[PDB]
């Protein structure tokens, strides 16, 4: 019971080694399904280290979009010490990881955001430019 949550980190690590079955898969599909399994293991590990919101974002994006594209396309083509956790009360707001990321990304690094807008603009223009034959 306590050894479970203790070795939970080491279990995700072992399953990740094992899943990286991706290389040895006879069928590339099967390889893509094992890639999805690896991504779920990654989401599991992310929650354990305290970054669950990232577990959910990974599920949303890499499995929800990137794995979906992968499958679409291929159907179509032929350190032993323990840390002290201490409390203090200086934080009166309900500020989480997502709020802080929004704060810094939209104020301290607005430039990075607009450059990412240009990068996504590229991610739109390019595929159209090379997969479509005009006129």
């Amino acid at each position: 019971m306590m050894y479970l949550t203790y070795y939970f980190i080491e279990i995700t690590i072992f399953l990740a080694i094992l899943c990286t079955f991706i290389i040895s898969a006879k069928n590339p599909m099967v390889s893509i399904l094992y890639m999805i399994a690896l991504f779920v293991i990654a989401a599991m590990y992310l929650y354990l280290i305290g970054l669950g919101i990232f577990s959910l974002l990974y599920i949303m994006i890499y499995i929800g979009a990137i794995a979906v594209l992968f499958l679409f396309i291929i159907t179509l083509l032929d350190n032993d010490y323990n840390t002290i956790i201490t409390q203090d009360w200086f934080n009166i707001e309900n500020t989480t990881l997502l709020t802080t990321i929004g704060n810094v990304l939209l104020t301290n690094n607005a430039f990075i955001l607009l450059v990412l807008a240009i990068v996504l603009l590229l991610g739109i223009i390019g595929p159209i430019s090379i997969t479509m034959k005009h006129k």
Binding site: Y81, N91, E93, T95, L97, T99, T100, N108, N109
Partner: protein
């Protein structure tokens, strides 16, 4: 830049000694810069806990080489359900 911002928008875990070290590097010059090497070791120490781990290593090593009993107010581990019991 986001340097110095913690996961909750405050100051990160290792801000204080970093800010002390910057107070150094502001006051000193290139010739005098070696003058606060100490602030930089403090910063790297907060970051990586290396001398702390070494000190704990020597403490554990000598502790496990001891058969005599220890008479000091001890540390007790309790289940999470048992916080505040009795």
């Amino acid at each position: 830049t986001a340097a110095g911002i913690s996961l909750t928008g405050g100051r990160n875990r290792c801000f204080s000694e970093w800010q002390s070290f910057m107070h150094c590097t502001a006051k000193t010059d290139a010739k005098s810069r070696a003058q606060c090497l100490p602030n930089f070791e403090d910063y790297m120490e907060c970051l990586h806990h290396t001398k702390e781990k070494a000190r704990l290593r020597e403490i554990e090593s000598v502790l496990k080489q001891k058969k005599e009993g220890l008479e000091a107010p001890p540390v007790k581990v309790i289940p999470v359900k048992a916080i505040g019991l009795v």
